């Protein structure tokens, strides 16, 4: 399986295109996310001489769900 | 006084040998069987209707979002699999829902209900719908 | 005649699905 989720790290917005979707923190529900690490719970991992913004978007058919979620774990590796 | 009403969780459509109940783990596809019982009460003529059994992702009964389970005294719509088996006449009222868990990030689903104690003497309040 | 009743347990599902991962610069 593969979706080819188009992730397009910008200078101020992380944007991931691929039902309601939401980031780790319940808002940012439309998919965009500000690059500010204090916004919708973006994970910061500064491995040496780089900085990656990891996040786990989730797609669910209805706000109640039955046996099917879409846990898209996308990261942005900035210089 | 207080007509203390209790409700438990049974494991099967089989309405006995239920779960003891501390924190139940279920397949989202699976089914659970909760029945409101009028234990420790009149039970000779007082029925037990199921008016507003509902669900919410918080111990508190006052949440912004909450699952309906059954509104307006019976059989909430919008749910594919709902069965109020014997709510109403008997001192035991039973209904079945498929497991679920809400939007956002919290795996904590709770069940809350509102119960009105009908009587079966010259009071035709069988819950009709 | 209109008391409120709650279930004394937590309903913990085992919802799980297809993990995905991607990269970007
Ligand atoms: C949730 C699930 O069913 N499987 C895995 C989970 O065990 C793991 O912790 C997670 C980390 O990204 O990835 C997914
Ligand atoms: C999420 O947005 C709702 C408005 O829909 C607001 O009530 C709530 O405080 C927000 N929560 C966070 C963590 O931003
Ligand atoms: C950190 O991870 C990125 C991911 O592509 C990689 O390019 C980089 O080499 C890693 N840093 C180190 C020090 O290995
Ligand atoms: C079903 O019937 C009774 C009560 O419903 C129970 O004692 C019996 O063990 C059950 N049989 C099963 C679950 O196979």
Author numbering:
A (entry chain C): 221 to 238, 252 to 263, 275 to 323
B (entry chain B): 349 to 477
C (entry chain A): 224 to 248
Copy text from the publication.
Glycoprotein 2 (GP2) shares a high degree of sequence similarity with UMOD (53% sequence identity), and has been recognized as a paralog of UMOD resulting from gene duplication. GP2 is expressed and secreted by the pancreas and serves a similar antibacterial function in the digestive tract as UMOD does in the urinary tract. Our structure analysis unveiled that GP2 forms filaments with its ZP modules, composing the ZPN and ZPC domains along with a linker that connects these two domains. Our study provides the first experimental evidence of GP2 filament formation and reveals the molecular mechanisms underlying GP2’s adaptation to a different environment compared to UMOD.
In this study, we extracted GP2 filaments from surgically excised human pancreas tissue and determined their cryo-EM structure at 3.5 Å resolution. Cryo-EM data were collected, and analysis of the 2D classes revealed a zigzag-shaped filament species similar to UMOD filaments. In the cryo-EM structure of GP2, the bipartite zona pellucida (ZP) modules (residues 221−478) comprise the filament core. The D10C and EGF-like domains extend outward from the filament core as flexible branches, and no high-resolution densities are observed around these regions. Additionally, two loops on the ZPN domains (residues 239−251 and 264−274) are also flexible and lack well-defined densities, likely because their conformations are influenced by the flexible branch regions. Each ZP module within GP2 filaments is symmetrically related to the adjacent module with a helical twist of approximately 177.2 degrees and a helical rise of approximately 66.3 Å. To form filaments, the ZPN and ZPC domains from a given ZP module are separated by an extended linker (residues 324−348), a ZPC domain from the previous ZP module (ZPC−1), and a ZPN domain from the subsequent ZP module (ZPN+1). These regions assemble through a β-sheet complementation mechanism, where the first and second β-strands in linker region (L1 and L2) complemented the fold of ZPC−1, and the third β-strand in linker region complemented the fold of ZPN+1. The side chain interactions between linker region, ZPC−1, and ZPN+1 are predominantly hydrophobic, with some additional electrostatic interactions. These interactions, alone with five pairs of intra-domain disulfide bonds, contribute to the stability of GP2 filaments, similar to UMOD. We observed extra densities for four N-glycosylation sites on the filament core of GP2 (Asn260, Asn291, Asn342, and Asn362).
